[PDB]
Symmetry: C3
Subunit: 284 residues, 3 copies
């Protein structure tokens, strides 16, 4: 049933270290349609999940499932190609293990993107939101990704999340957007985690507006919590597919096809942005 413990994560890391010969400092997890950066991986090594000891089985959902290692912007990185989402039914242990493997591989910074709905009236389709905090409905409701025995080797029983979204990384991301004159697309905000897989209902959207949420999505918070637990710094950026409040007012529906079209519209800019961020990251 593979628990995301020290022994099991170590066995996966040992396999990866041997096969790739890359020691990554940075990890990357991408939103759907936002995977182009993994094409710029120089000296790349592709490792199917299915080959890695103790990695989660992903064949029921299918589609791509690779760990990709190599160099971006002069830095060594490890990327997940084929993301695990909790609405697919993956367990807490299955979500946690690949991030803890990143930790054992030497990852100190995790960069994450996702697609999400805009709740704040200021947000438009195609905007970026630097996530500065979250409202974790699964966590409040006994489905926190850390429910279960604590793995002491990685972190504490009761983590504090007040610094889960690194302030310096947010400031660096904004700086680079300003230098390249697309800062008008960049916002900061609070992310509500909707477990999914149904989109927020119109009345759910309205409730989230009342509760001080700026953005809503079905991902990212579980990964953030596992990273924070084991001391990995996180930058999380949402690409806004739509404004759910406006759509509710106008009786307009959300669909994944529209979402992917927005991802295609911004994928190249997001790639350029994150490549520069990687280049500008501290060597420490």
């Amino acid at each position: 049933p593979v628990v995301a413990n020290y022994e099991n994560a170590s066995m996966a890391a040992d396999y990866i270290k041997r096969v790739s010969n890359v020691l990554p400092d940075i990890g990357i997890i991408c939103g759907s349609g936002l995977g182009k950066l993994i094409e710029e991986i120089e000296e790349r090594k592709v490792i199917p999940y299915i080959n890695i000891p103790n990695f989660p089985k992903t064949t029921v959902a299918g589609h791509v499932g690779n760990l990709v290692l190599g160099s971006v912007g002069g830095r060594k990185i490890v990327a997940m190609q084929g993301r695990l989402h909790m609405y697919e039914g993956y367990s807490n242990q299955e979500i946690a293990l690949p991030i803890r493997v990143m930790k054992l591989l030497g990852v100190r910074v995790l960069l994450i993107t996702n697609l999400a709905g805009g709740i704040n009236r200021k947000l438009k389709s195609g905007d970026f939101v630097l996530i500065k905090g979250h409202i974790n409905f699964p966590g409040l409701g006994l489905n926190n990704v850390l429910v279960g025995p604590n793995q002491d080797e990685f972190g504490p029983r009761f983590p504090d999340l007040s610094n889960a979204y690194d302030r310096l990384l947010q400031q660096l991301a904004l700086k680079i957007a300003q230098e390249n004159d697309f800062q008008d697309l960049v916002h900061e905000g609070v992310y509500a985690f909707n477990g999914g897989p149904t989109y927020e209902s119109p009345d759910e959207s309205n409730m989230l507006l009342k509760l001080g949420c700026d953005v809503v999505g079905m991902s990212t918070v579980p990964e953030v919590i596992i990273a924070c637990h084991c001391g990995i710094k996180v930058l999380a950026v949402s690409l806004i597919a739509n404004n759910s409040i406006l759509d509710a007012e106008n009786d307009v529906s959300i669909n994944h096809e529209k979402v992917l079209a927005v991802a295609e519209k911004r994928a190249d800019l997001l790639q350029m942005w994150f490549k520069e961020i990687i280049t500008r990251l501290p060597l420490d």
Copy 2:
């Protein structure tokens, strides 16, 4: 462990088709104490769940468990006699399969009733509420009925719920209430799904009032989401057992005995109402 997939649903539908010789266009799921309509089933065929391949086992909870087919108001219908509720511990797969069997049987419209608590100050015991939207706390909290692999043959990975409660069906229900001069009992509103089985606490009721909820109950939203996913139109009506906000202000308790007494008070009127709705439904 029977997954609610295409193959398993097909095997159940094939058994039912053979035994009943009825091709239903309408499905019906009833609230507790609101099952009288299933007595007007003409040319009826009763099929115990326990006889149907792949139907959920319900013997731990016990009580009645039949699929009933036949004719109401000149239309062919299929009804669940003995409802599956998620607070009993049924899985996502167990809730989903009977609705997907309805889909394969040919159901295009699902009519659902339930008993619920009033939050909106305008609501009194014995009132009806046409549900026009919902706040799905289990869904926000990673217990959405669709969590797990998607069954592509039935619907999309990410459904939009903005039209989950059919507007035309709401308007028809209200029209019939007006013709029979009981429209003063009929409201529209937003339904909060409390997983249950404890009634909303007084402070939970107060919170729901702040969040724009009109009614709260422990059912119906899972069925609505499975129906919406596979393209079945839904009319959902709550019978109000009590006003939870007033009861909290007056330190008055809710109990199931009082709830069933309200169901008995309105069961015959609800039967007449729904029979007329069935008669007036489009042939398409």
Copy 3:
């Protein structure tokens, strides 16, 4: 998989009755660092959980796990030394069984303490809060401790929680605080149940403030609901470790070390308080 049913609870109670020769009227469950009262147990009998038929296995988490019986303040009591929390991954059945064993042993009143975060601006580190109601996010989200088959021998399918926190017991606790001149430390309030194990995020804290929550913690509500279901009266007291709203405004982190330091600061006073409450409890 041991269900918390009548037969299984009876087997545990029969073992305990034989080994201890104590018939307790009062049960006690303590917050972390607040276990000193279990040192004043006169004529004490210590029974490891691992020896009791059908008790939950707790070796993965480890640490102490004893049932302690004996006399406090002239009354016969049973205490849990080593508390089961749902964020550890224990099931509904594992949480419920020890409280139902208390019921079969003859417990009529359950006294519970916990450590929690202050949301209400009036609350300071070291304050006590008499819990008068709750917001149960796991319950709203389909993780209520009673989800599953109902055990009819203990209580009803649909409990009402409006009297879950006994008013007379709250008044008695306050009276004793007044007599001993520490009533300035004592508040009353509404408790939000955060499943855990991560502390409330700063934005979650802000949301809880908007929703009328006074205190937030990761315990106690499951035990309250099982006790209420089987007719045991409850007094629940939170010791405030910090004010989460102030900490968010000042960018100050919460950690368990700080929490335990507050418990140490108030443990002796809480012991004296609860011993007096036990002495003053009705003989009925």
